[PDB]
Design a protein around this nucleic acid. Sequence first.
DNA 1: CATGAATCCTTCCCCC
DNA 2: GGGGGAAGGATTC
Length: 341
Amino acid sequence: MIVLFVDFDYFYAQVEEVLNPSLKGKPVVVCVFSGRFEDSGAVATANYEARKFGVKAGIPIVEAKKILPNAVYLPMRKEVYQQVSSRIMNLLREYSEKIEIASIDEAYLDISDKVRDYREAYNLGLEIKNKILEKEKITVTVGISKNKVFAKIAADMAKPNGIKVIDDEEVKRLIRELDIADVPGIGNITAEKLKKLGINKLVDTLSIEFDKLKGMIGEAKAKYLISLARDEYNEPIRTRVRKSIGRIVTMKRNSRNLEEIKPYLFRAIEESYYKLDKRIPKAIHVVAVTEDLDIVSRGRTFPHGISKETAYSESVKLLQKILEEDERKIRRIGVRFSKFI
DNA sequence: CATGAATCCTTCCCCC
DNA sequence: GGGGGAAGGATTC
Ligand SMILES: Nc1ncnc2c1ncn2[C@H]1C[C@H](O)[C@@H](COP(=O)(O)OP(=O)(O)OP(=O)(O)O)O1
Ligand SMILES: [Ca+2]
Ligand SMILES: [Ca+2]
Ligand SMILES: [Ca+2]
């Protein structure tokens, strides 16, 4: 089997260059302003020019300005990136339609039925890198190997504007050499639990006996890692259906007064219904972020679908529920609809 | 100073 | 005991 993985580069920023190419050559930061104070918020992505000087995702806008005060700071326009992505996805559809859309930025492709070997795949790689570049002026990175995981790894190695192959062999070394934290699905929290078990490398998994492993990470995380290191990981590609929709918004100031908060919440809902389009949810959660960045949620599943009118009233019941249980102030509030039909 | 969602986990609860 | 399913939270990207 041959999987081809595609990650678009500094994607929001890149789209921003493509739309105003005067930007090409300057450091660019797409960021998301909360508006509690002037230039509050966080960086979403930045082009490589900016990333050189340590300006990347997650970091606060304030601290990006301490480094690169003469850079360009644009508000995120997600909906645009969304359409552009969609276009790009349709180019790939007609290169193979055994296709998994991971994120806005990433997709996998079975091309067993189109290529025979890693040579002629690479070719498919470049045809695509190119097709996309010509059609949309977008640089991407392409990774290829025998399954989804190693494809994704291939790309991470090759970033940016790269293309890389990890043949049925070189897996070998990675299973021995490659750091466990650079494995997809292993964030800091999980990585540190494994370092704490003397597993800094994908092969160490077999030394330990499963049941201790399972207890500390989880059955599926364990199985996942074991199959990788053992080499039987061969999860397929498929199309993936959206199961959940919802927005979550930041308030002017932390609060526990219901009347101050409800408006913010009614924005989240209406946006969510606009976004729902034709589909109808049976479940609704309300979600609050505390002043010290903790998340609580309360929800409810209905035996039937949910009208706009219902959602409005039911959400108030849940925020009321959140308020008398958790005593902290609320920083951000919002909703999430689940369980369509 | 810190801005959408899938998947997994753990804890209940109902019940046969 | 174990199936079936909900809630709330944990974790990843
Ligand atoms: N930590 C984050 N905070 C906010 N937005 C993010 C974050 N990670 C990713 N995104 C959004 C913005 C990105 O343009 C897009 C895809 O992310 P990702 O592939 O991780 O990096 P990137 O597309 O910015 O550049 P690159 O892939 O070259 O690092 O999703
Ligand atoms: Ca990317
Ligand atoms: Ca990691
Ligand atoms: Ca990503």
